[PDB]
């Protein structure tokens, strides 16, 4: 049966090349499938071309778009560099007053709204400013409140950067990010203001995470058609909202409240193997192989694919079909 299964699987693989590029007819669907996808499945590659992750929401929130968008905001990775239309490095020699009328209005707001400790620390504010003209649309897209998210986490992280910030009602969202340093700094250090502050400003934009989970570049809304038993007993079509990402981090997405943690799936079976087990990895691998074979319309009986999958995952782990997987086995030397 082994050679029968191998011949059955690999005969349609020869003809699969022709119709692999039908998905090439959709430019916005640049997802690996066909010969390269089968190659990557067989090699058990640890770096897929296009990893992905599909999240199904809770039964209550499935039919409404609003909770879905809240979850989508709560999953996607948000960083400061993405939310500043002008995070401009400016000279801020005397933060007490400025020439620009727009920031002048914001000046007196906090200058009458700062505590005594801030009054003492007035001199700590850098002779340069991260002057943040922040885009309204990007800030409101992630449901990001100006004050709490802008300052709580940022000052909590290292007590490194203080801010004079306005309420969202101003026509131009201007934040003044002024880093905080002790006055005990050395004279040679204190002379090189620009040298410290450009570096810390870059480390500030790049390395501060306002909200979200790492490695997930995009999250996107989609509508699908489930089939459910109606109360009278027959099967009816029912729509639902799901979230498809671009990038996989399954250990942290799984615990986010507001989703269904028992119907999550990804096309990277190594992660499923690491998180859920080896039988789960076997099922996911079977789904991947069946999908790549059947996306061309060809039909291959279940026993052949079941045998290949069982062989590939019988040693307790994923054994690739290469020399590293089979030629390092315990079989005979001449074999």
């Amino acid at each position: 049966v082994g050679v029968l299964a191998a011949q059955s699987i690999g005969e349609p693989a020869t003809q699969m090349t022709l119709n692999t590029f039908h998905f090439a007819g959709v430019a916005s669907k640049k997802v690996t499938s066909g010969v390269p996808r089968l190659k990557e499945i067989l090699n058990v590659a640890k770096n897929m071309k296009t990893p992905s992750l599909t999240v199904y929401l809770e039964p209550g929130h499935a039919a409404d778009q609003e909770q879905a968008k809240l979850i989508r905001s709560a999953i996607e990775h948000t960083t400061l560099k993405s939310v500043t239309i002008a995070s401009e490095i400016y000279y801020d020699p005397d933060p007490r007053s400025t020439v620009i009328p727009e920031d002048e209005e914001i000046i007196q707001l906090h200058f009458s709204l700062l505590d005594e400790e801030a009054e003492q620390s007035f001199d700590q504010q850098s002779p340069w400013l991260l002057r943040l003209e922040l885009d309204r649309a990007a800030m409101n897209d992630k449901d990001l409140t100006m004050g709490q998210v802008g300052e709580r986490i940022k000052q909590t992280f290292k007590n490194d950067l203080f801010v004079i910030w306005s309420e969202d009602n101003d026509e131009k969202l201007i934040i003044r990010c002024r880093v905080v340093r002790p006055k005990s700094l050395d004279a040679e250090t204190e002379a090189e203001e620009d040298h410290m502050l450009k570096k810390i400003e870059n480390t500030m934009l790049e390395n501060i995470t306002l909200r979200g989970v790492e490695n997930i570049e995009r999250v996107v809304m989609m509508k699908y058609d489930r089939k459910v038993p109606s109360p009278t007993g027959e099967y009816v079509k029912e729509p639902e909202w799901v979230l498809e990402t671009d990038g996989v981090n399954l250990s942290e997405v799984m615990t986010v409240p507001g989703i269904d943690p028992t119907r999550i799936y990804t096309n990277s079976f190594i992660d499923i193997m690491e998180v859920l087990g080896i039988e789960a990895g076997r099922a996911a691998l079977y789904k991947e192989v069946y999908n790549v074979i059947a996306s061309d319309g060809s039909y291959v009986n279940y026993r052949h694919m079941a045998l290949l999958v069982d062989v590939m995952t019988t040693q307790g782990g994923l054994t690739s079909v290469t020399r590293h997987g089979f030629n390092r086995s315990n079989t005979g030397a001449l074999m």
Partner: peptide
């Protein structure tokens, strides 16, 4: 946080 055994793919 999340029970692994309650997934659909885990027999």
């Amino acid at each position: 946080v999340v029970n692994i055994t309650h997934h659909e793919l885990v027999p």
